[PDB]
Amino acid sequence: FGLLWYLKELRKEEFWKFKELLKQPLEKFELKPIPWAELKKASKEDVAKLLDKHYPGKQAWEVTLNLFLQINRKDLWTKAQEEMRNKLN
């Protein structure tokens, strides 16, 4: 779960916002939000698994990166893009 490598960097309040945003309408991608019942006491590892269950493929990364921007972690956005660009070489 390469997603978890970045998710682990969220501090407590940023992670709470991240989970709340996952349950709300995802208007930029017209995807279905994660049903709220599934995020009851979800740890960082659990969220990484839910992202891969619900938004497999590039979708999970698209969602996660967009949420990073909404919770003011553009540092993590930039790091994730850098990894993805390095994979294209």
Swiss-Prot record:
What is this protein's tissue specificity according to the annotation?
A: Expressed in ileum intestinal epithelial cells. Not detected in peripheral blood mononuclear cells. Expressed in cerebral endothelial cells and, at much lower levels, in brain pericytes.
Annotated membrane-spanning segments are none
What is the annotated localization of this protein?
Cytoplasm; Inflammasome
- Tell me what induces its expression: In brain pericytes, up-regulated at the mRNA level in response to oxidative stress.
Q: Which top-level group of life is the source organism from? A: Eukaryota
Q: Which residues form the Pyrin domain?
A: 1-86
Please give the family membership noted in the entry. Belongs to the NLRP family.
Function statement = As the sensor component of the NLRP9 inflammasome, plays a crucial role in innate immunity and inflammation. In response to pathogens, including rotavirus, initiates the formation of the inflammasome polymeric complex, made of NLRP9, PYCARD and CASP1. Recruitment of proCASP1 to the inflammasome promotes its activation and CASP1-catalyzed IL1B and IL18 maturation and release in the extracellular milieu. The active cytokines stimulate inflammatory responses. Inflammasomes can also induce pyroptosis, an inflammatory form of programmed cell death.
What is its quaternary makeup? Sensor component of NLRP9 inflammasomes. Inflammasomes are supramolecular complexes that assemble in the cytosol in response to pathogens, such as rotavirus, and play critical roles in innate immunity and inflammation. The core of NLRP9 inflammasomes consists of a signal sensor component (NLRP9), an adapter (ASC/PYCARD), which recruits an effector pro-inflammatory caspase (CASP1). Within the complex, NLRP9 and PYCARD interact via their respective DAPIN/pyrin domains.
Q: What is this protein called?
A: NACHT, LRR and PYD domains-containing protein 9
Q: Which residues of the full protein are shown?
A: 9 to 97 of 991
